[PDB]
Amino acid sequence: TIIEPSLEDMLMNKKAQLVCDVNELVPGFLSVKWENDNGKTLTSRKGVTDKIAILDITYEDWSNGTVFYCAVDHMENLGDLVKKAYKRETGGVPQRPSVFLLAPAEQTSDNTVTLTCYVKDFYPKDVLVAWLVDDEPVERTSSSALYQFNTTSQIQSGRTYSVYSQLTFSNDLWKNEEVVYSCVVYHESMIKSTNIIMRTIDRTSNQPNLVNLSLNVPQRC
Amino acid sequence: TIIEPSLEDMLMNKKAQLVCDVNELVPGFLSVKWENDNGKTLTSRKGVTDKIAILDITYEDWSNGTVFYCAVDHMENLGDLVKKAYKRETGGVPQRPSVFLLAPAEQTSDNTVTLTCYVKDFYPKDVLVAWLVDDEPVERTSSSALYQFNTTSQIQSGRTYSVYSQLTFSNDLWKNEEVVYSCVVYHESMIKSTNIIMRTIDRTSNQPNLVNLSLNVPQRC
Amino acid sequence: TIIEPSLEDMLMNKKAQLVCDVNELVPGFLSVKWENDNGKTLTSRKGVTDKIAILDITYEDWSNGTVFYCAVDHMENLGDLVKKAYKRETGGVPQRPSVFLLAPAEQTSDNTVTLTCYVKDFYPKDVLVAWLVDDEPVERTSSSALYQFNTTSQIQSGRTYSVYSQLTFSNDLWKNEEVVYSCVVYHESMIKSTNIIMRTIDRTSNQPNLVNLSLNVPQRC
Amino acid sequence: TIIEPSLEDMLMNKKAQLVCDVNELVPGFLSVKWENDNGKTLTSRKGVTDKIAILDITYEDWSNGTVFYCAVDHMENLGDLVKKAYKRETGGVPQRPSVFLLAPAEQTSDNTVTLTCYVKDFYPKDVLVAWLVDDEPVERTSSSALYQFNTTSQIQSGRTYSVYSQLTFSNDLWKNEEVVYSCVVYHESMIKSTNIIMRTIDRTSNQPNLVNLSLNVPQRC
Amino acid sequence: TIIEPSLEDMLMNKKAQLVCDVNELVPGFLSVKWENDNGKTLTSRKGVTDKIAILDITYEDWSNGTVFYCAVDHMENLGDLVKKAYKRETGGVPQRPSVFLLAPAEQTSDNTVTLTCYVKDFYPKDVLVAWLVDDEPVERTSSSALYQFNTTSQIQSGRTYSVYSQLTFSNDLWKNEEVVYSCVVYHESMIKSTNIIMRTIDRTSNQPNLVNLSLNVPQRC
Amino acid sequence: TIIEPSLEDMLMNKKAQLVCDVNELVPGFLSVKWENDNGKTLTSRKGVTDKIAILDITYEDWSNGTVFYCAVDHMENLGDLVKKAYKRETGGVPQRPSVFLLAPAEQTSDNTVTLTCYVKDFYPKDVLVAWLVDDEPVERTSSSALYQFNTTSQIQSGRTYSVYSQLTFSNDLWKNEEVVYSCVVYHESMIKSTNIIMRTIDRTSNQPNLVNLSLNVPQRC
Amino acid sequence: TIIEPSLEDMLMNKKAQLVCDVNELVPGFLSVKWENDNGKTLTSRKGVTDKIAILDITYEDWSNGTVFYCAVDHMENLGDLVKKAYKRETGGVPQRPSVFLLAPAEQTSDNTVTLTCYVKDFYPKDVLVAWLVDDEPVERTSSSALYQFNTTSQIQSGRTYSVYSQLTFSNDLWKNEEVVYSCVVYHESMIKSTNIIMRTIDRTSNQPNLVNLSLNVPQRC
Amino acid sequence: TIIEPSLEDMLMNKKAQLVCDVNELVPGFLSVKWENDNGKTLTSRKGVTDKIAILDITYEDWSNGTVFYCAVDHMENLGDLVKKAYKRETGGVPQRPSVFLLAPAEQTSDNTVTLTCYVKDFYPKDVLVAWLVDDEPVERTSSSALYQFNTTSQIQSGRTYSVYSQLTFSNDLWKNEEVVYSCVVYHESMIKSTNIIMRTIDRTSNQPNLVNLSLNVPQRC
Ligand SMILES: *[C@@H]1O[C@H](CO)[C@@H](O[C@@H]2O[C@H](CO)[C@@H](O[C@@H]3O[C@H](CO)[C@@H](O)[C@H](O)[C@@H]3O)[C@H](O)[C@H]2NC(C)=O)[C@H](O)[C@H]1NC(C)=O
Ligand SMILES: *[C@@H]1O[C@H](CO)[C@@H](O[C@@H]2O[C@H](CO)[C@@H](O[C@@H]3O[C@H](CO)[C@@H](O)[C@H](O)[C@@H]3O)[C@H](O)[C@H]2NC(C)=O)[C@H](O)[C@H]1NC(C)=O
Ligand SMILES: *[C@@H]1O[C@H](CO)[C@@H](O[C@@H]2O[C@H](CO)[C@@H](O[C@@H]3O[C@H](CO)[C@@H](O)[C@H](O)[C@@H]3O)[C@H](O)[C@H]2NC(C)=O)[C@H](O)[C@H]1NC(C)=O
Ligand SMILES: *[C@@H]1O[C@H](CO)[C@@H](O[C@@H]2O[C@H](CO)[C@@H](O[C@@H]3O[C@H](CO)[C@@H](O)[C@H](O)[C@@H]3O)[C@H](O)[C@H]2NC(C)=O)[C@H](O)[C@H]1NC(C)=O
Ligand SMILES: *[C@@H]1O[C@H](CO)[C@@H](O[C@@H]2O[C@H](CO)[C@@H](O[C@@H]3O[C@H](CO)[C@@H](O)[C@H](O)[C@@H]3O)[C@H](O)[C@H]2NC(C)=O)[C@H](O)[C@H]1NC(C)=O
Ligand SMILES: *[C@@H]1O[C@H](CO)[C@@H](O[C@@H]2O[C@H](CO)[C@@H](O[C@@H]3O[C@H](CO)[C@@H](O)[C@H](O)[C@@H]3O)[C@H](O)[C@H]2NC(C)=O)[C@H](O)[C@H]1NC(C)=O
Ligand SMILES: *[C@@H]1O[C@H](CO)[C@@H](O[C@@H]2O[C@H](CO)[C@@H](O[C@@H]3O[C@H](CO)[C@@H](O)[C@H](O)[C@@H]3O)[C@H](O)[C@H]2NC(C)=O)[C@H](O)[C@H]1NC(C)=O
């Protein structure tokens, strides 16, 4: 049995859905159930399949740290109860991440270009990084067959966390057209206002004085 | 009797309040009323004073263009009815503004510095502009009124519009802060995602010059 | 009844014309009148229509703060008298604005560029901003199709005023790169010398420095 | 049970050791065993504890892709056999990775700086990265409480990989006259490529400059 | 008897005064007279001394080319009549000048600098050149004592004219300031919109790039 | 009767010719005469016409300040004597001028270009300015109509003077021939040394950028 | 017996002195003599010593190529006659040289700076090169002891010749004076106009864009 | 009798030959002889003709300053002995020479370009300079009229010396955007010192550049 954490972007609307899927498919299955910590009857809903239980959760409970239980009641497995739990690590006071958007270091001869948004020192583990091309998400922009965004794992030093996000596209488009790309960070520290943090960049508006020199001495004979 | 349009900032959360103030204070007053276009009985609420009527409106009605009526029913003015209306032009497809964040142009001497945020070609006439000093609203932060900001009036052309916004503060902070400022543009062209357009100027570092170098001396032909 | 302030540009010749238009057109009309503060018979002139009253005012009176009165004497409205007044505030000493010419705002998405001329703190409200293409006003050469200019309203911080003005044209003309533009500002604090202040821009300015090289010296041990 | 891949740095001497650890510690344990794919008796050695099996492997087998098997023979678990294996993904050919040193990310809030090393593409999933400070990787009187380094996970696209690694230290050391930092990358393609980043001060005029180098000079004493 | 042309700056207000001074002072004098071409009685007035005749002339007459006559009627010289004439060449249509601001000319030996404003190929011979420091005339400043300016004669190449004008001051103001000096050119052709043309110059305008760096990277083998 | 000062270029050979022309041509003429200050008989010569008197003068007399009187002795005018004088102001002590050669300010659009020569602070007040295209007088080369040039009049500030000289030609030549233009200033402040001061602009090459590199990988610990 | 060619600088005044000195001092001496090619009596003068014979020569004869004879008539050597000759190579039309002034190549800290003047392809072998500092000869300047100058030998390729002249002084003086230097070449092809060619140089005025970088790789152990 | 100094290039192998030629050819000749300072019998060899004496010398003697004597023993001249000597002044410490490559001298009139090599300070007054293109001697497969090289004499200020050398060729080859020209200098105080110059073009934007470098890299294979 596997559970999926509620989507962050939606909980930034004070609502979301916590689904619990069942993996014990080797034997038969009977029904899913969503219960409370005390075992009280917690109202729930049914998903596409009977092995999937959906539960609507508001920001109040999610932030407060309340723990819910998803259980499987197969006729053959009723001898035991796999009463999984949704435990959220709480405590501490949120720390605001420090976002840095780094320009690409690829040279002209290179084939593709990558933009990296790096965020450091935020305590709450859950975060989300998205990208915009000019002012529309890359996942929905018309030009979406040549952009590839990804996010790495979280590296923890002390009580805080840090991650690196990425977005890659062809060098020709980087050096041909003129648009502004933005890395958008969703984090809990910014719930009071905006609910979001952003950093923008474009080729023509960086103007870093530069000098490039390459020396090859073949030493050939 | 004067009405005030709902605050866009909170209407982006799909809810808001339309308050109705009464100006005919020269004679006495009896009661306020909030009705529909057809004159039906439209549920309302009461503000601090009896001359103030509050009405809760969702984004559905506001965007659809439904018109409400606020009326005054003074015992002496009952001969007539000042049944004001809230008319909000609806028009057609919106347009996404193109924001530009223009940097200061003053010199080392001037006592003050000014950041300009020009936002152009947004068809709907409802727009809001805020500023963030480092990551939090400039209105509330460590700055004890050290930061001031004001927005100009709107320009028209075609069926579009345009506007500027300015943030002013002493240049001592400008050259001894090492922070990142940002102009936030609340508009309804991006109601499908984020609901905000940002442009930022980063001062956390100052590496104006860069140099790259490579040197291969293959010692084997 | 609506009044129009005397043109500043004309008043930079120590002459102008204060026109008085009548808005109470729902009933009939009889005659216009231009009087003094004391109600004395102040000589006036007549415009195209009987509802338009022209009054010639010299710089002496306008600067001194003298107040004139325009009245309507309709046969039916003679019971009352809507004796309008023209009052220009004059409490202070002028201040010289610091004009700045900000960075160009290009957008290849629509192939258009806009240049912003910003006027900083100046006490007296009366100001006027015009544009020159090379050495003649933009409204002479090709304004009919290529160039469009506009100016916003004033924003008052303390006792002083600021205003933004813009000029917009195609980016293809931007690439001509053989045209210096210039914004000229008229204001009352320059009456002693030339009545204007000028600033200029050119397509080529504030551009970074880049040097790229590759060398292959084939040595021969 | 759990196995640990052979060290890449050691394997750059054409030898290494593959250790096999046992995790089924809930019941007792009897002996470890290291066998071949066919089950033949493969000579092995014993480590500090009986639950640890060490096997010496040369570069020939490791590169060829030969698979070895580690088995546990507990007196109670003899009913079954957990004959784990060591499967290495081998295909195509090594791809020369390009490594970039990204711009530093200063943060005056806590007075720290971070340098990033980004290895773009490399087919085989095995890679190692180390940081040098004037040729002083770690424990060389500097890496005690001054410099910290970590490495992220692998992000895969198509049939290639990439990774980031970071080095963090206080900005006080970042303001020294000149210090040489390097990011050596040991990859199974015998790369051993060192990329240098330095902070230099212009001599004729004093201005901060950031220099990047890539000496490939194969000069050896 | 010598005549003085009307001031151009005043005539940019459509008014001026043509003075007639008498030089035949060796014998006595009786009275001055200002007449028309036909000898008709042309009204005039008198100045400080009886030998000075003032005549008010408007813009129309001056541009049209009308010629006035100044005569002396000494009791002894009445035998003849020295009927002076004011002839102003009219010719064809005007031309505009192309104003240029040439390079500065410094002298460390004498510790002084000089700025030149060159006007090129304007047809009408009447032109005036004035200087501004920041936005006010040089002749009226706290530093006006240490500012010297002058204009040369007119060199006629073909049908057009050219003349040079300069401004000289010490080298310390030049090095240690951020003032923008401007040369203003009044001329008849540029009369419809504004009466003047302007240019600007600043110490830090055209400079060369310079990069000077040194490096020492102790590798090891 | 009018006199012409001796040419400076020839007096830089310590010899010259002082010609005396006669203007009283309304009546007849008899003979010219060249005398001394004391009226003594000063030997002279005869020019093309009897009304022209030539007198050979060396540098000694010219510099010393000696005067000479040219007189007309017409049979009818013998009643009086128009005994003109050649008075050359002398005093002070020569001051060597400073020469500045100012490059053209024009751009690639206009079809004419101009070079400027600014000579300043020459006390004797006797200068001559010439131009050389390629070490050849502009007036004796293979393109005379293709080059035009005139100098302005002196402007005096204290006891010194200053002048401007201009050389004008088409913009096509300025981009093609790649020659070395120079401005030659004849003055008496340096008779002891070379009698001229030159300033040159060289256009025989165009290497706007120059890079210097040096490597050293000592192979000795 | 040794002869010295007449000075050129003075031959540019159409006069000079050809002196012949006697070296046969081992025996006694009687008298010097200056004769013609035909042996005719050529008038001469006597110098400081009886062994030195001076002969005044004009530029007409010197250019024509006439050969003179200087002879020694010692009482003991009268048996023979050492009738030396002054033969000038006059075999073609003069060719004007092309002079190039080269800026110093010293970078910094070199303690010395050199200025080179290279003359190219002049036919007549006789030429002189001199140097001027702020337009005053180096020999008779206040800072004469701070400057050194020298001229190399002549290298003949075909029918023409070429030379290199040099001027060396301290680097600090080069970087802390802001003066203008100039190399002046005296040659015969320029007798028509100014008798000389001249090139000028200045540190600040001549400053193309440049980049200077060095890289030591101390291979320490 | 004339002698020829030993070749420096050969002496860079610690051996050479000192040839002694005889000029007293007017009378007969008998035999040559090579002796020591003391007159002792110093072994020698015979060249093509009897009048030429060859003597093999190692670096030891040549550097030490030993002086040899060459004598002629003609049957008629035996009355005297013209015992020539080979004395090389060598009393001082060697100092490294500094080599500069001055700016090219382009003469488009003749379509030629000359490069200059300048050796600034070498104490031993024996030096050799060679030019090479593409790492090939100018006299190797490049000795045709395509290239021409020469060297000037030596100029000494005090204890040191300096020289100039030139290489001339048509500028058609100079327009080839990539060729390497080098100076190699042999001198006692060193062994070899190369200095290359190239004529490249900026890759991103066309802008010719002139590069100059001195790769001291041992690079010995
Ligand atoms: C580099 O990054 C890795 C990955 O974040 C760091 O290892 C991780 O360290 C954290 C703790 O800082 C581990 O989380 C938890 O640690 C506590 C320690 O008491 C433990 O009780 C929890 O059960 C949990 O393990 C995390 O699991 C661990 N991850 C891995 C893959 O090792 C590492 O410390 C970082 N090193 C440096 C020098 O920054
Ligand atoms: C410069 O900006 C000003 C302010 O936007 C422009 O004036 C405005 O021009 C628009 C053009 O459509 C006017 O729209 C009109 O609105 C009234 C509202 O009652 C409507 O009845 C008309 O049919 C029309 O839609 C707007 O009123 C007007 N506002 C003001 C204060 O004048 C001005 O036109 C701009 N300059 C240029 C050159 O366009
Ligand atoms: C931002 O700009 C706006 C527009 O200029 C400022 O609003 C203006 O503020 C001034 C100063 O308080 C107001 O002047 C007042 O005018 C009334 C008469 O209308 C007079 O009775 C008062 O004594 C005072 O002089 C002006 O009316 C007001 N205009 C508008 C349209 O609101 C605003 O204060 C600026 N600063 C901000 C918003 O922080
Ligand atoms: C962003 O980076 C992550 C790094 O994990 C990428 O996820 C990984 O993508 C690779 C390549 O598709 C997956 O490899 C696959 O592994 C399975 C066995 O686990 C194998 O059966 C497949 O044939 C293939 O080799 C890898 O599993 C997958 N890992 C995870 C945790 O998802 C992700 O695809 C990257 N996304 C973008 C947009 O670049
Ligand atoms: C700008 O340049 C003009 C032209 O040189 C200057 O005017 C000239 O100034 C000089 C020196 O004061 C005058 O010389 C003297 O004039 C008086 C009066 O005629 C005479 O008695 C003296 O013997 C001597 O010649 C010169 O005449 C005068 N010329 C003109 C046409 O005014 C002018 O002063 C310069 N501007 C400034 C601010 O100095
Ligand atoms: C490099 O420069 C040297 C400069 O000396 C050139 O050597 C000189 O070449 C000229 C060629 O005409 C020689 O002229 C000859 O002079 C003798 C009398 O000495 C005369 O009898 C001949 O008829 C002819 O005029 C000159 O003597 C000679 N000088 C020396 C010292 O060698 C050399 O040729 C130049 N080489 C190149 C490749 O440019
Ligand atoms: C310019 O360069 C020339 C050539 O190097 C310099 O001429 C040289 O000057 C030195 C003296 O400073 C002479 O050295 C002396 O030579 C005599 C024998 O001739 C010897 O007895 C002395 O003890 C001393 O060594 C050297 O001969 C001479 N070389 C030539 C070729 O003339 C000249 O000094 C430099 N400076 C100037 C201003 O010309």
Residue numbers in the entry:
A (entry chain B), B (entry chain C), C (entry chain D), D (entry chain A), E (entry chain E), F (entry chain F), ...: 225 to 445
Copy the relevant paper text.
Polymeric (p) immunoglobulins (Igs) serve broad functions during vertebrate immune responses. Typically, pIgs are comprised of two to six Ig monomers, each of which contains two heavy chains and two light chains that form one fragment crystallization (Fc) and two antigen-binding fragments (Fabs). To assemble pIgs, plasma cells typically link multiple copies of heavy chains together with a protein called the joining chain (JC); however, incorporation of the JC is variable among species and heavy chain class. Here, we report the cryo-electron microscopy structure of IgM from a teleost (t) species, which does not encode JC.
Guided by previous structural studies indicating that the human IgM constant domain CH2 and Fabs are flexible and poorly resolved in cryo-EM maps, we expressed and purified a truncated teleost IgM heavy chain consisting of CHµ3, CHµ4, and the Tp. We utilized this tIgM Fc (tFcµ) to determine a cryo-EM structure to an average resolution of 2.78 Å. The refined tFcµ structure contains four tFcµ monomers (Fcµ1 to Fcµ4) that lay approximately flat on one plane and include interfaces between Fcµ1 and Fcµ2, Fcµ2 and Fcµ3, Fcµ3 and Fcµ4. Fcµ1 and Fcµ4 are separated by Tp residues, which form a β-sandwich (hereafter termed Tp assembly) comprising two β-strands from each of the four Fcµs. Despite similarity between the two halves of the tetramer, the complex is not symmetrical with respect to all four Fcs; rather, adjacent tFcs are related by distinct angles measuring 81°, 72°, 86°, for Fcµ1 and Fcµ2, Fcµ2 and Fcµ3, Fcµ3 and Fcµ4, respectively. Specifically, the C-terminal 38 residues (residues 411–448; FG loop, G strand and Tp) adopt one of two folds, with chains A and H adopting an A-type fold and chains B-G adopting a B-type fold. In the A-type fold, the FG loop and the G strand include residues 411–416 and 417–426, respectively, and the Tp folds back to form β-sheet interactions with the G strand. In the B-type fold, the FG loop and the G strand instead include residues 411–420 and 421–426, respectively, resulting in Tp β-strand (residues 434–441) being directed away from CHµ4 where they form β-sheet interactions with other Tp(s) rather than the G strand. Interactions between adjacent Fcµ monomers (e.g., Fcµ1-Fcµ2, Fcµ2-Fcµ3, and Fcµ3-Fcµ4) are dominated by a common set of residues in the CHµ4 CD loops, FG loops, and G-strands, forming an interface of ~1360Å2. Cysteine to serine mutation at this residue produced a tFcµ monomer in solution and eliminated evidence of inter-chain disulfide bonding, further suggesting a critical role in tIgM polymeric assembly.
